[PDB]
Design an enzyme around this catalytic site. Sequence first.
Site, PDB file in Angstrom:
ATOM      1  N   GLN A 157       0.861  -1.199  -0.221  1.00 31.60           N
ATOM      2  CA  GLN A 157      -0.014   0.030   0.071  1.00 31.60           C
ATOM      3  C   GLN A 157       0.794   1.229  -0.020  1.00 31.60           C
ATOM      4  O   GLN A 157       2.065   1.285   0.679  1.00 31.60           O
ATOM      5  CB  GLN A 157      -1.001   0.030   1.331  1.00 31.60           C
ATOM      6  CG  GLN A 157      -2.358  -0.875   0.972  1.00 31.60           C
ATOM      7  CD  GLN A 157      -2.058  -2.418   1.042  1.00 31.60           C
ATOM      8  OE1 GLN A 157      -1.013  -2.804   1.362  1.00 31.60           O
ATOM      9  NE2 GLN A 157      -3.054  -2.818   0.681  1.00 31.60           N
ATOM     10  N   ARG A 158       0.329   2.264  -0.770  1.00 38.63           N
ATOM     11  CA  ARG A 158       1.288   3.691  -0.722  1.00 38.63           C
ATOM     12  C   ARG A 158       1.517   3.996   0.840  1.00 38.63           C
ATOM     13  O   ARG A 158       2.704   4.355   1.055  1.00 38.63           O
ATOM     14  CB  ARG A 158       0.198   4.622  -1.347  1.00 38.63           C
ATOM     15  CG  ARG A 158       0.894   5.857  -1.590  1.00 38.63           C
ATOM     16  CD  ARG A 158      -0.182   6.905  -2.350  1.00 38.63           C
ATOM     17  NE  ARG A 158      -1.471   6.982  -1.269  1.00 38.63           N
ATOM     18  CZ  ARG A 158      -2.502   7.502  -2.008  1.00 38.63           C
ATOM     19  NH1 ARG A 158      -2.779   7.120  -3.225  1.00 38.63           N
ATOM     20  NH2 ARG A 158      -3.532   7.474  -1.024  1.00 38.63           N
TER      21      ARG A 158
END
Lengths: 161, 314
Positions: free
Chosen positions: A55-56
């Site tokens: 995830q970012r």
Amino acid sequence: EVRILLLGLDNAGKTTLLKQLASEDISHITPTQGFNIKSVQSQGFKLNVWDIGGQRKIRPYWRSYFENTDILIYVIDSADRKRFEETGQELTELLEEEKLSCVPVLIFANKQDLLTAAPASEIAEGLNLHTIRDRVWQIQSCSALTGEGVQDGMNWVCKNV
Amino acid sequence: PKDYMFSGLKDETVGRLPGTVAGQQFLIQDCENCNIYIFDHSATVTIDDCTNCIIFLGPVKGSVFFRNCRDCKCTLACQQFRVRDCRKLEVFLCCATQPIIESSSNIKFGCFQWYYPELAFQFKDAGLSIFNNTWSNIHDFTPVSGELNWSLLPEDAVVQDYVPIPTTEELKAVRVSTEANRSIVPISRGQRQKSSDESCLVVLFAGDYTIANARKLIDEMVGKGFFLVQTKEVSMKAEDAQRVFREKAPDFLPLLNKGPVIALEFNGDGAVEVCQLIVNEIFNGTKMFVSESKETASGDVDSFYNFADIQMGI
Ligand SMILES: Nc1nc2c(ncn2[C@@H]2O[C@H](COP(=O)(O)OP(=O)(O)O)[C@@H](O)[C@H]2O)c(=O)[nH]1
Ligand code: ALF
Ligand SMILES: [Mg+2]
């Protein structure tokens, strides 16, 4: 003996690939919040695979894993063209990292079983992989779900240990 | 080559009939004020930059991923549910794993509640068990101190008010019911607050009438004022049976290799006794585990989820 770091965007198929490698159940995989580790045997080598959440939000944590990495495996969802720019940026930044200098990179072009899946050759062109000149690299088409193409990628890995 | 996407549509009602997707990937992007009904199974779905849409997704074998969406109302079943950069989504969810949100706000969740004749086989084709549904245990990658980016839809929420059934001629062949007692996915409470600390575990063993048995037991228990908390479908090894059932295990060992067991967790004052009484009448001749007492029931449930989380986990 061989430390493999498994990276790529969220939803790329890294953990699905991790379970495929370990010869384990592929059909039920939860999104990874932190990280997973598994040891796998291949061609006389023992591969310690570090499977990291992508995830970012949690990509800053990626650097915490770089030290002593022998091989980078970077997984791309070939059927998520919408995020080709995002994955290109992350790969480019990874290869600039001091702690990963000279580290061989296998790019898995995953989810080839899917309809809109871009061929490996198209992904290599769009991400300008030929400009990678500071290390050895390979792109390998695969489906972590069926397992097809996966072994072919891992043979390259064991060749470049 | 990609009549497997809806793209750039505005103020439209569109869909896919059973058989027209057949496990292929589907894509949705840049749709506003649209009603979208995919009544078929798919490999994966991504929804990008959609605004004010009503979306039904048939069983998704892989992930469903919402990105940059606002004010959408959705009913869907999937292996993984993912949300990024979204606001004001309301979803009736069946998810095999833990739903995740990221950089998102005001995301509300309810249990999957939908039926049509083709739906059961679509679940099977997508490899999704109707009993493996964790729809309420959300993980937020980007929480904010002292506040919550997600919550659970009101229990009394009416599905038709969020995701109405289609009224177009093109989509009329699909005969939909949003009734809770017709839903292919049984309505589970999951993480909702409970009144009562009394639980009851039921374990049913694999077989041709087991799904029907489970639905009947749920109906009867709900009919007596009790609550279905959660269900599970998982393979049980001999050691697992010994762990959960204790001294009652020898009765169940010959049945473990039939296929995966189906576990039900009920909740409410009197739940164990009532469940025993129902089973005693309507399932004589069919072996199934029921908690012996309320004092041992919570242990039964915890031991069951203990082994089940390990086997299903990475
Ligand atoms: N069709 C298909 N789906 C895949 C493949 N690899 C992974 N998936 C699915 O893609 C979703 C994300 O996979 P996951 O392993 O959790 O991604 P990760 O975040 O990179 O670890 C899951 O629903 C997987 O079942 C593949 O080769 N083909
Ligand atoms: F679930 Al991920 F990287 F998104 F492991
Ligand atoms: Mg993962």
